[PDB]
Amino acid sequence: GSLHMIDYKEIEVEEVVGRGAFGVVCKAKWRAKDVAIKQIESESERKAFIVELRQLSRVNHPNIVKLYGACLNPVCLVMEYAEGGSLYNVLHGAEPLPYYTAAHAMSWCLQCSQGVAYLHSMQPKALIHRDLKPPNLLLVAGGTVLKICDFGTACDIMTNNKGSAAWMAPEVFEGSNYSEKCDVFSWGIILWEVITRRKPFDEIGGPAFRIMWAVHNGTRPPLIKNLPKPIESLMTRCWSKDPSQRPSMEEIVKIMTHLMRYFPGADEPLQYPCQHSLPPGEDGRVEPYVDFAEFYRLWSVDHG
Numbered sequence: 001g002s003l004h005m006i007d008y009k010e011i012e013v014e015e016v017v018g019r020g021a022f023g024v025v026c027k028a029k030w031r032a033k034d035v036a037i038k039q040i041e042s043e044s045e046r047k048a049f050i051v052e053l054r055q056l057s058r059v060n061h062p063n064i065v066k067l068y069g070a071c072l073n074p075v076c077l078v079m080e081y082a083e084g085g086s087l088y089n090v091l092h093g094a095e096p097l098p099y100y101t102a103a104h105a106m107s108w109c110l111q112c113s114q115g116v117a118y119l120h121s122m123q124p125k126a127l128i129h130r131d132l133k134p135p136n137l138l139l140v141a142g143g144t145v146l147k148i149c150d151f152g153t154a155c156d157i158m159t160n161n162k163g164s165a166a167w168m169a170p171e172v173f174e175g176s177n178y179s180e181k182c183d184v185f186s187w188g189i190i191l192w193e194v195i196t197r198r199k200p201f202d203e204i205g206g207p208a209f210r211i212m213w214a215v216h217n218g219t220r221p222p223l224i225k226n227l228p229k230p231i232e233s234l235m236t237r238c239w240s241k242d243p244s245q246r247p248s249m250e251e252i253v254k255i256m257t258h259l260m261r262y263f264p265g266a267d268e269p270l271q272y273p274c275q276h277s278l279p280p281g282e283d284g285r286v287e288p289y290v291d292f293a294e295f296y297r298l299w300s301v302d303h304g
């Protein structure tokens with residue numbers, strides 16, 4: 001790709017917005033444009049920096065963060081500023097939590113799958129994200145647009161134990177020959193998480209090896225009460241122990257694109273508060289946070 005060798009005299013830092021998977025992300029203003037500058041925090045983060053610079057220059061997609069340029073002394077990346085913060089803060093963050101509809105849960109998953117499909121379509125070698133999880137998915141335009149970030153783990157299609165235990169494919173930690181179908185497993189977990197508004201494997205106590213043993217032995221998140229059968233089949237196909245039994249990310253884009261007919265209003269910004277910070281009863285099945293009543297209504301209009 002093509003990056004700008006920006007000097008520190010051209011970038012104006014406003015505040016520290018937090019730390020991502022690696023480095024320190026700071027709010028900044030460069031050439032009448034709001035940018036995010038990820039700087040080196042420790043000398044150990046130089047491998048992840050070279051990798052993210054190498055991969056981010058190749059990518060160009062609306063559902064993936066835009067890398068404007070990079071600096072040399074000291075080395076830092078200058079990407080676009082994601083106004084709405086991370087999806088993890090929207091779902092499980094500090095109060096007040098924002099209200100979101102079933103259209104938002106599906107739109108975010110569609111945009112995530114669209115982004116991952118562009119990475120998996122890369123030539124001559126596909127680009128696997130390996131760390132697909134809500135802390136790495138940012139929101140912009142009133143929380144209506146999702147953008148995948150943190151490509152420090154990303155690699156060309158291996159190295160085992162990449163990501164966070166709750167959204168990690170079982171073959172990744174098993175020391176098996178994993179493929180781009182490991183991102184598909186993560187997507188299925190993210191789908192469950194945005195529909196229920198629950199952190200996957202919260203009941204299974206830490207450390208990560210406890211979740212790894214559970215997922216490795218077939219344990220998946222609880223089934224969702226009243227979840228539409230088309231969505232339930234897509235979600236549990238992504239959770240398959242066999243990665244070849246999981247659908248391709250391009251098939252997920254086609255399927256989610258088609259379901260969006262029954263999920264209108266995804267372009268409405270998140271502006272209402274949410275005091276329904278209530279974790280209901282666990283009895284093998286969980287209640288969805290979102291409501292599928294409007295889906296069933298629109299589906300009946302087309303299918304008898």
Ligand SMILES: NC(=O)c1cccc(-c2cc(-c3cc4cc[nH]c4nc3O[C@H]3CC[C@@H](O)CC3)on2)n1
Binds near residue numbers: 017020036082
């Ligand atoms: N990490 C990256 O690769 C990357 C790449 C491109 C843009 C950005 C980015 C993150 C933020 C941000 C904005 C707000 C507003 C309220 N709260 C926020 N929290 C924010 O970020 C935190 C949560 C996500 C971590 O990755 C970073 C800390 O704005 N732009 N991050």
